[PDB]
Design a protein around this ligand. Structure first.
Ligand code: MG
Ligand code: MG
Ligand code: MG
Ligand code: MG
Ligand code: MG
Ligand code: MG
Ligand code: MG
Ligand code: MG
Ligand code: MG
Ligand code: MG
Ligand code: MG
Ligand code: MG
Ligand code: MG
Ligand code: MG
Ligand code: MG
Ligand code: MG
Ligand code: MG
Ligand code: MG
Ligand code: MG
Ligand code: MG
Ligand code: MG
Ligand code: MG
Ligand code: MG
Ligand code: MG
Ligand code: MG
Ligand code: MG
Ligand code: MG
Ligand code: MG
Ligand code: MG
Ligand code: MG
Ligand code: MG
Ligand code: MG
Ligand code: MG
Ligand code: MG
Ligand code: MG
Ligand code: MG
Ligand code: MG
Ligand code: MG
Ligand code: MG
Ligand code: MG
Ligand code: MG
Ligand code: MG
Ligand code: MG
Ligand code: MG
Ligand code: MG
Ligand code: MG
Ligand code: MG
Ligand code: MG
Ligand code: MG
Ligand code: MG
Ligand code: MG
Ligand code: MG
Ligand code: MG
Ligand code: MG
Ligand code: MG
Ligand code: MG
Ligand code: MG
Ligand code: MG
Ligand code: MG
Ligand code: MG
Ligand code: MG
Ligand code: MG
Ligand code: MG
Ligand code: MG
Ligand code: MG
Ligand code: MG
Ligand code: MG
Ligand code: MG
Ligand code: MG
Ligand code: MG
Ligand code: MG
Ligand code: MG
Ligand code: MG
Ligand code: MG
Ligand code: MG
Ligand code: MG
Ligand code: MG
Ligand code: MG
Ligand code: MG
Ligand code: MG
Ligand code: MG
Ligand code: MG
Ligand code: MG
Ligand code: MG
Ligand code: MG
Ligand code: MG
Ligand code: MG
Ligand code: MG
Ligand code: MG
Ligand code: MG
Ligand code: MG
Ligand code: MG
Ligand code: MG
Ligand code: MG
Ligand code: MG
Ligand code: MG
Ligand code: MG
Ligand code: MG
Ligand code: MG
Ligand code: MG
Ligand code: MG
Ligand code: MG
Ligand code: MG
Ligand code: MG
Ligand code: MG
Ligand code: MG
Ligand code: MG
Ligand code: MG
Ligand code: MG
Ligand code: MG
Ligand code: ZN
Lengths: 99, 208, 99, 83
RNA sequence: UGGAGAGUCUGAUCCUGGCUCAGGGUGAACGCUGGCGGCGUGCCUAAGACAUGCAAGUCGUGCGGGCCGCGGGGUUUUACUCCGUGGUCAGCGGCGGACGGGUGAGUAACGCGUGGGUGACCUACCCGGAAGAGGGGGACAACCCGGGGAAACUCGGGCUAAUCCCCCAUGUGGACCCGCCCCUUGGGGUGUGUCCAAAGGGCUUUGCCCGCUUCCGGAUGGGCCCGCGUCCCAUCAGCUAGUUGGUGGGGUAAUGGCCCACCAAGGCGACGACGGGUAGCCGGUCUGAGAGGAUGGCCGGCCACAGGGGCACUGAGACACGGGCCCCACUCCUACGGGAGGCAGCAGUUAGGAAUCUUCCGCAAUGGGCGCAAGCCUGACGGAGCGACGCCGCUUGGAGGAAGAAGCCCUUCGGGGUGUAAACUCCUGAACCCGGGACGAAACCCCCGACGAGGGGACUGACGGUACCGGGGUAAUAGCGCCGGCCAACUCCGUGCCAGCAGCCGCGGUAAUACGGAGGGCGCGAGCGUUACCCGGAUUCACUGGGCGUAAAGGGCGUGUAGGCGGCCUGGGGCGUCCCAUGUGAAAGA
């Protein structure tokens, strides 16, 4: 018995906690941004959106989201905050988005 | 292991002289002299009109026993001729004639087929400089069939070649009698064989 | 090549979708007479353009739904309801031959 | 990674190889991309090695990796000679 | 280049008609018998259960240590402590455990075959090209301390390194929103805005090797989609609730009722839906004149499964045979609280079964993983072992030898047969002995040359002292079926509807060529017969290629739905049809 391929499993549970953590931030930031887009705060929503995006691409850097998955979440996020900003638009910061 | 036993009995059972005994199938002892009826207790009884199957059977046996071959190699050679281009009937005969043992006999190296088979088996035969101990080896045209110089001084070879002096050889063969050489010039034609056998009957024995 | 078939729209009753019936002629592999088989495709109609009885080309397309892999290329022949009548009648015979 | 190697097609005690382009992950006697040569190691015939250099050079421009022995036999047929 | 029929219904006939046989095949098994070698092949049943051993690791040129040992230092001595080095152990980290090996259970399905789509996508390592690597910060093992448990193991506290992790920067470039251009399904370009890079190690240490980062392309492997084809039952006729479609959303690499909410009421079926039975599919294989039937073992390609069922994690890739969690059944340990397992991997065991092998050698070759390399692992593989299981080659002697011994068998008692067969004469020389003795092996590596081309050189065997060669050399296994017709081979005696033979037709109730033995003969021969199964004959499911007055078969009659089929002329089209080119039709097999 006792293969030391078991080492692999020990590392699995390491990376599981790495991946799982960054995603949880992503979601918790993404929602946050949208919550202010719906609530018409433009500057704060865009400020948070830039941090969301940064966290997304940073998770693409490694083995969490590596593919165009990160680009998926970005796309959906920018669409949602722009459209939610369409209610009394006033895009104050205008940082994250294009003119 | 081929048929091994009394042979001049099959001389009788076929009704034709079978020279498998070599000599003494010539001297009036062959038992085809003054005993042309088949063997057994009922040999001298009046034989019944054979069935159409009986005819093709006795013709195939008449050929098979002549070349001294198991049924297995016999049929595999036949099916080989059935596939090859040309007349199945004569192609088969050319193939049987191409057996190294048969060539040896045919070149007058051996008194008989069987003797030719033993001579091949014991490696006394050269082919293009190489020893070949398989009686089944297919001779090609242009192959030199010699006698191993090891055995050239043996008294059986000098015995047979002594009587081969001035004896004529088949039109598809030629031999040098002093150096104990020989050559397979080409495949024999139907007319090149005096075989008392109807090939069509044999072909017709395998259609069933 | 994307496969392209020509058939007759036998169903209007969906939204943004039409059923196309496509005949097909081929010699029987053993008995050799020419037999006529036919298959129904669910084709995508984004503009609700094509109506019942239309004879339309249908093109192999990126999957739209379960059971929808074709889109309506163009209109061949407008509104010959005799085809639809053969299909409807044949459907209608099945109410017999049960009990 | 695509590789250039040998595939054994002789019989027992009689090996004959087929210099072959295949994915490293397939069986050695399994499905390959292209047969680009044969190798007879007992050298039974006058021609016991054939290569078609200019095809091997193709598969090397795209990064097939030859075995140590494949490279031995390729070099012998002059695949790498650049003069 | 290819096509044979026969027996059996009648007193006899012709026809119809089933049954039977001759042929070929097999992962075979059974009986008698059994000499050698080569190449193939070998659990078809319980996808039943498994003792034992091996079957996937590797890298010290990513990093820090523990234990055991040696040497050299700072000191007058000790204590303490610094550097070098050897062996070993794991740990942290990277690449590989998704290949390769096994099975045929599930599956009638885009599962497979075949031809395509992907403007709906992914692809580690490999190849080509562009560009870059600046600075800072942190943690968990190992280690040390402590606790619980019988054990498996487990919990807590503290220190620490890195090619582990994170923040800043730099923006070749890439990603996202929006706009514009060209394309046309989410393809390419562009603008503003936002977001995103990295790691070191080694020496022959000034330069180079192994790595690292972003991007484009290539190559390879793959996902998903579609047309067509894919067994039996209609004594299965109706099926369907995410079910069919829509809008939006979630998810994924990616389309998609894949999932979710809401809306519409749809979708499928006699061209066989739904249900039941059966089953991996193919390249092929077998048979057949072919059309066809049968089949999918070994080998190659695809799929599915890993005790049964579900599930996700890590990852380029798995929902993972030798990884994880849970439920169930079973075996084992158990301090009764709780634990450990998973040969359909190689051998091997047991069960079942008519039946299926060695607990073999080897890393020498080929191939695969890790490694700068040296090298390590590889029951993949290469070989050997067993089994007439198949195919093939080969031996049990050759030549002379009596108008013909003995024995046996028959007889008209004259003789006939076994039979040139034996004896016996001569010749050769399977076995076995002796010596020599391989190919498979040349690269990796070293040296010259620049670690390139090129040249040069060195180590490297399981099989195996086997193959093979040379010398010497002995007459040295034969069996099994059959002899009434089909079907090649006949007499004697024994037995008397007995004992029994038998594929079919039939033999035997005192003269049996059919039973049993013998003599003899026919057929094959290291085999020969038998049983089972497949095709053939069978034109006996009739496309090729049959029929229905009396032989089996016209619906009791009509009307008519679907479907099938369609008179003469002309014109368009060109769907079927025919022609040309072209891509495809893997390798093997043929
Ligand atoms: Mg490891
Ligand atoms: Mg939260
Ligand atoms: Mg993932
Ligand atoms: Mg012929
Ligand atoms: Mg001639
Ligand atoms: Mg025939
Ligand atoms: Mg509509
Ligand atoms: Mg849809
Ligand atoms: Mg209905
Ligand atoms: Mg593969
Ligand atoms: Mg050259
Ligand atoms: Mg013709
Ligand atoms: Mg009759
Ligand atoms: Mg009658
Ligand atoms: Mg009668
Ligand atoms: Mg009949
Ligand atoms: Mg036949
Ligand atoms: Mg048979
Ligand atoms: Mg025995
Ligand atoms: Mg063998
Ligand atoms: Mg099995
Ligand atoms: Mg089978
Ligand atoms: Mg061992
Ligand atoms: Mg000291
Ligand atoms: Mg030193
Ligand atoms: Mg050490
Ligand atoms: Mg150490
Ligand atoms: Mg270690
Ligand atoms: Mg595993
Ligand atoms: Mg596999
Ligand atoms: Mg299989
Ligand atoms: Mg079913
Ligand atoms: Mg299908
Ligand atoms: Mg398909
Ligand atoms: Mg395909
Ligand atoms: Mg640090
Ligand atoms: Mg620290
Ligand atoms: Mg640990
Ligand atoms: Mg701690
Ligand atoms: Mg701790
Ligand atoms: Mg990193
Ligand atoms: Mg730029
Ligand atoms: Mg920009
Ligand atoms: Mg940055
Ligand atoms: Mg750093
Ligand atoms: Mg592709
Ligand atoms: Mg959708
Ligand atoms: Mg994934
Ligand atoms: Mg719903
Ligand atoms: Mg249909
Ligand atoms: Mg099954
Ligand atoms: Mg054939
Ligand atoms: Mg036929
Ligand atoms: Mg089948
Ligand atoms: Mg089939
Ligand atoms: Mg098997
Ligand atoms: Mg299962
Ligand atoms: Mg399971
Ligand atoms: Mg990986
Ligand atoms: Mg699993
Ligand atoms: Mg699986
Ligand atoms: Mg296992
Ligand atoms: Mg108990
Ligand atoms: Mg048993
Ligand atoms: Mg074996
Ligand atoms: Mg040994
Ligand atoms: Mg090896
Ligand atoms: Mg190797
Ligand atoms: Mg390497
Ligand atoms: Mg090991
Ligand atoms: Mg093997
Ligand atoms: Mg036996
Ligand atoms: Mg004799
Ligand atoms: Mg002598
Ligand atoms: Mg060698
Ligand atoms: Mg050599
Ligand atoms: Mg140098
Ligand atoms: Mg060189
Ligand atoms: Mg080596
Ligand atoms: Mg040796
Ligand atoms: Mg010798
Ligand atoms: Mg002698
Ligand atoms: Mg004797
Ligand atoms: Mg017969
Ligand atoms: Mg007869
Ligand atoms: Mg009998
Ligand atoms: Mg009596
Ligand atoms: Mg009597
Ligand atoms: Mg009587
Ligand atoms: Mg008798
Ligand atoms: Mg009988
Ligand atoms: Mg008898
Ligand atoms: Mg007898
Ligand atoms: Mg034999
Ligand atoms: Mg047999
Ligand atoms: Mg039959
Ligand atoms: Mg038929
Ligand atoms: Mg019938
Ligand atoms: Mg029948
Ligand atoms: Mg009839
Ligand atoms: Mg009647
Ligand atoms: Mg009648
Ligand atoms: Mg009537
Ligand atoms: Mg009637
Ligand atoms: Mg007409
Ligand atoms: Mg019509
Ligand atoms: Mg016309
Ligand atoms: Mg046309
Ligand atoms: Mg063509
Ligand atoms: Mg081919
Ligand atoms: Zn004679």
């Amino acid at each position: 018995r006792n293969l030391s391929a078991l080492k692999r499993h020990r590392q699995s549970l390491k990376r599981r906690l790495r991946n799982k953590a960054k995603k949880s931030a992503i979601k918790t930031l993404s929602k946050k941004a949208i919550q202010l887009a719906q609530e018409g705060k433009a500057e704060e929503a865009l400020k948070i959106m830039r941090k969301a995006e940064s966290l997304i691409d940073k998770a693409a850097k490694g083995s969490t989201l590596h593919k165009n998955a990160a680009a998926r979440r970005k796309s959906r996020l920018m669409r949602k905050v722009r459209q939610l900003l369409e209610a009394a638009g006033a895009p104050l910061i205008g940082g994250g988005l294009s003119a | 292991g081929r048929y091994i036993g009394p042979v001049c009995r099959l001389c009788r059972r076929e009704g034709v002289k079978l020279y498998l005994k070599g000599e003494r199938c010539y001297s009036p002892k062959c038992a085809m002299e003054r005993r042309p009826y088949p063997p057994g207790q009922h040999g001298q009884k009046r034989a019944r009109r054979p069935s159409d199957y009986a005819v093709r059977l006795r013709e195939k046996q008449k050929l098979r026993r002549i070349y001294g071959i198991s049924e297995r190699q016999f049929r595999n050679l036949f099916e080989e001729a059935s596939k090859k281009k040309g007349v199945t009937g004569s192609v088969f005969l050319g193939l049987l004639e191409s057996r190294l043992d048969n060539v040896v006999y045919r070149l007058g190296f051996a008194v008989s087929r069987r003797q030719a088979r033993q001579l091949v088996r014991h490696g006394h035969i050269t082919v293009n400089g190489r020893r070949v101990d398989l009686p089944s080896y297919r001779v090609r045209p242009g192959d030199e069939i010699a006698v191993a110089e090891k055995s050239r001084n043996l008294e059986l070879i000098r015995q047979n070649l002594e009587a081969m002096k001035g004896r004529k050889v088949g039109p598809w063969l030629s031999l040098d009698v002093e150096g104990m050489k020989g050559k397979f010039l080409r495949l024999p034609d139907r007319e090149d064989l005096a075989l008392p056998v109807n090939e069509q009957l044999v072909i017709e024995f395998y259609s069933r | 090549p994307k496969k392209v078939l020509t058939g007759v729209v036998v169903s209007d009753k969906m939204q943004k979708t039409v059923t196309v019936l496509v005949e097909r002629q081929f010699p029987h592999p053993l008995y050799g007479k020419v037999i006529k088989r036919s298959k129904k495709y669910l084709a995508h109609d984004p503009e609700e353009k094509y109506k019942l009885g239309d004879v339309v080309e249908i093109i192999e397309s990126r999957p739209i739904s379960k059971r929808k892999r074709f889109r309506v290329l163009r209109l061949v022949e407008s509104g010959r309801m005799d085809l639809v009548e053969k299909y409807l009648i044949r459907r209608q015979n099945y109410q017999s031959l049960s009990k | 990674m695509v590789k250039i190697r040998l595939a054994r097609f002789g019989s027992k005690h009689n090996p004959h190889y087929r210099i072959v382009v295949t994915d490293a992950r397939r069986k050695r006697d399994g499905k390959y991309i292209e047969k680009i040569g044969y190798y007879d190691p007992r050298k039974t015939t006058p021609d016991w090695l054939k290569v078609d250099v200019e095809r091997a050079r193709y598969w090397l421009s795209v990064g097939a990796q030859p075995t140590d022995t494949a490279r031995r036999l390729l070099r012998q047929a002059g695949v790498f000679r650049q003069e």
